[PDB]
Amino acid sequence: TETTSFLITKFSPDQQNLIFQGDGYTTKEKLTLTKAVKNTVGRALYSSPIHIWDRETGNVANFVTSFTFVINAPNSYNVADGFTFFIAPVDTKPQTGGGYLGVFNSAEYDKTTQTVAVEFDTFYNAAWDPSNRDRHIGIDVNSIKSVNTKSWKLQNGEEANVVIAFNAATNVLTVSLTYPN
């Protein structure tokens, strides 16, 4: 059996257990991925590699992650790109920026990307986002073109509570986002 757990309820300026990429950094007790500036990318990864499936046994891990995040845009009409929680190879570096969310490089399935992401997408990319043009949550598998999406109304500046859980017996990934009002 192998378990990994961590809880961080307030970030420190020297958070040595995180890996920061691009614009990512900590403090005001918070983790900042991007400031409100154009054409940028920030990522933050947990330091320890996680054993998510076992080659010997073929077992796959159950996991749950909870986090609170905020998007703060100058006006709620012009926001861009979005945010993701992602699972990727151990030595991942930032992928394409902008609509690709720093996690993918195409809208076609690329098996070498080897990444699963839960996206909170704030900008409609005609090439691949839902034609309703709504902001949305999406499950992404080796492509920026989600396997499934749900329309989501962004509450600018509000804390969003998210829970993402994976059930190994069923291979079901569940995502929940909750705003207090």
């Binding site: 500036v37 499936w53 891990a61 992650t65 909870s66 845009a73 993701t84 990727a88 720093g102 569940t174």
Partner: protein, 47 residues
């Protein structure tokens, strides 16, 4: 209280390597916003 839920089947074993790193990413374009995380908890169990 406003909630959004989404679920789908992902065969993790066929997509990601045996060892992974987890994390967050955010990006901006011509339009932008700040993206911040206030708290984070994670638990995994491999039997």
């Amino acid at each position: 209280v406003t909630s959004y839920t989404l679920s789908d089947v992902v065969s993790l074993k066929d997509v990601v390597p045996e060892w992974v790193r987890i994390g967050f990413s955010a990006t901006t374009g011509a339009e932008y916003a700040a993206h911040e995380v206030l708290s984070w908890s994670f638990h995994s169990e491999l039997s």
